[PDB]
Design a protein around this ligand. Structure first.
Ligand SMILES: OC[C@H]1O[C@H](OC[C@H]2O[C@H](OC[C@H]3O[C@H](O[C@]4(CO)O[C@H](CO)[C@@H](O)[C@@H]4O)[C@H](O)[C@@H](O)[C@@H]3O)[C@H](O)[C@@H](O)[C@H]2O)[C@H](O)[C@@H](O)[C@H]1O
Length: 384
């Protein structure tokens, strides 16, 4: 029997690691073969088509939507052994009031911004805690290195790489400042999107002042490691997970990680948390028990550790004696709270693609910042 498995993993390191775990399983389980697909930027649409057809892979990544999008398609995992080791922070995300456990997490999100620590030290820059401090850090980097380095780098041929910027900054913009937020209108379903303009404007000024890569619209995730590894990049969104690979290329580099900065004075930064890579079992799998056996195999301390190390993402289980990759900085920001992804819990499914699409067009010049907010509103209403 062959089990189908789908994953949102796009990093060669992590994908191979997953593959070799799948292989170790196959060699310990005679009847059972595992085929894994990694469609990356096309993942979410492929799974929407599979849900609509009700023809799901046996194992599939839920990538932040286990309950809200995939819930009806998932088998209940609550009786599996690994469950007692789930980091409590994920309890409300992967469990419901019935006791159901919707998916198994390979890791979890703790997303901010990654930077070249040695470069920041060279320009007398502390890690920015506000958007405005970030913009100033970008300006210093540019003029101080005299244009040698790209202050903030985005693989903008990939929509998600741009959506990511908006999605993270929406939190401090619209949610966390209890004096300036839009939770009520978001929970009404009446949010008008005027605030969102600030984000699009910010990105436009970043390209206006050459604070980002000029090849942003053509830049691909492939190219990042190379440039970080040769000290031509100040900042990237932490989700690019390049610290493992760039170290393997150049062990001299001191990278740091910092939370997503605040937008309004008085507000604090936030880590953005929740699911990153998960595997759920299709409720209607013909090999339910085999599919769960893969998960049980994968949840062994050793394989948790393998998969943990293949990224810089923190671990999801409490059972691993291993420290998180950036535990050093996390101690330094023990004060900072964790927020869920803005699009995962405050928006209907669909807004992520619009976020990324409109990020591209802003950069290409097809839309002004105001017209970006307008497209988001239009699509947000359409989704209700
Ligand atoms: O991050 C918030 C986002 O989370 C879910 O999105 C799922 C996501 O899956 C694919 O990307 C996963 C991929 O992300 C990283 O890689 C890149 C390049 O660094 O970053 C982009 C996302 O910011 C991504 O498109 C690029 O591949 C990460 O390093 C890697 O480990 C991950 O496997 C897909 O490409 C992307 O578009 C998304 O569909 C969630 O569904 C979203 O709603 C949102 O909350």
């Amino acid at each position: 029997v062959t089990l189908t498995m789908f994953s949102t993993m796009t990093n060669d390191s992590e994908k191979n690691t997953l593959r070799s775990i799948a292989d170790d399983f196959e060699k310990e389980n005679e009847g059972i073969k595992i085929d894994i697909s990694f469609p990356g930027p096309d993942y979410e649409n492929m799974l929407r088509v599979k849900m609509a057809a009700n023809d799901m892979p046996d194992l599939f990544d839920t990538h932040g939507w286990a309950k809200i999008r995939y819930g009806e398609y998932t088998a209940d995992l609550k009786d599996m052994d690994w469950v007692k080791h789930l980091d409590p922070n994920l309890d409300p995300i992967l469990k419901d009031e019935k006791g159901k456990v919707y998916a198994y997490p390979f890791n979890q999100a703790k997303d901010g911004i990654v930077y070249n620590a040695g470069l920041l030290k060279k320009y007398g820059l502390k890690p920015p805690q506000t958007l405005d401090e970030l913009m100033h850090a970008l300006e210093t980097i540019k003029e101080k290195s005299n244009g040698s380095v790209i202050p903030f780098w985005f693989a903008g041929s990939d929509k998600g790489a741009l959506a990511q910027f908006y999605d993270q900054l929406a939190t401090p913009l619209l949610i966390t400042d209890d004096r300036r937020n839009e939770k009520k209108a978001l929970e009404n379903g009446t949010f008008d999107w005027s605030d969102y303009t600030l984000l699009a404007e910010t990105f436009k000024e970043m390209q206006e002042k050459q604070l980002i890569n000029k090849d942003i619209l053509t830049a691909k995730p492939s190219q990042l490691v190379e440039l970080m590894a040769q000290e031509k990049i100040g900042f990237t969104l932490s989700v690019t997970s390049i610290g493992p690979d760039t170290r393997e290329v150049n062990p001299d580099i001191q990278l740091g990680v910092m939370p997503t900065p605040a937008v309004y004075e008085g507000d604090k930064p936030s880590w953005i948390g929740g699911e990153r890579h998960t595997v759920a079992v299709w409720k209607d799998s013909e090999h339910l028990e085999e599919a769960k056996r893969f998960i049980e195999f994968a949840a062994q301390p050793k394989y948790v550790k393998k998969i943990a190390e293949a990224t810089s993402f923190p671990q999801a289980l409490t059972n691993t004696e291993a420290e998180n990759y950036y535990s050093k900085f996390y101690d330094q920001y023990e004060e900072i709270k964790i927020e869920p992804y803005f699009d995962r819990v405050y928006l209907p499914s669909g807004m992520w693609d619009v976020m990324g699409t409109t990020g591209q067009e802003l950069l290409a010049g097809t839309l002004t910042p105001k017209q970006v907010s307008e497209k988001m509103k239009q699509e947000y209403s359409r989704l209700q």
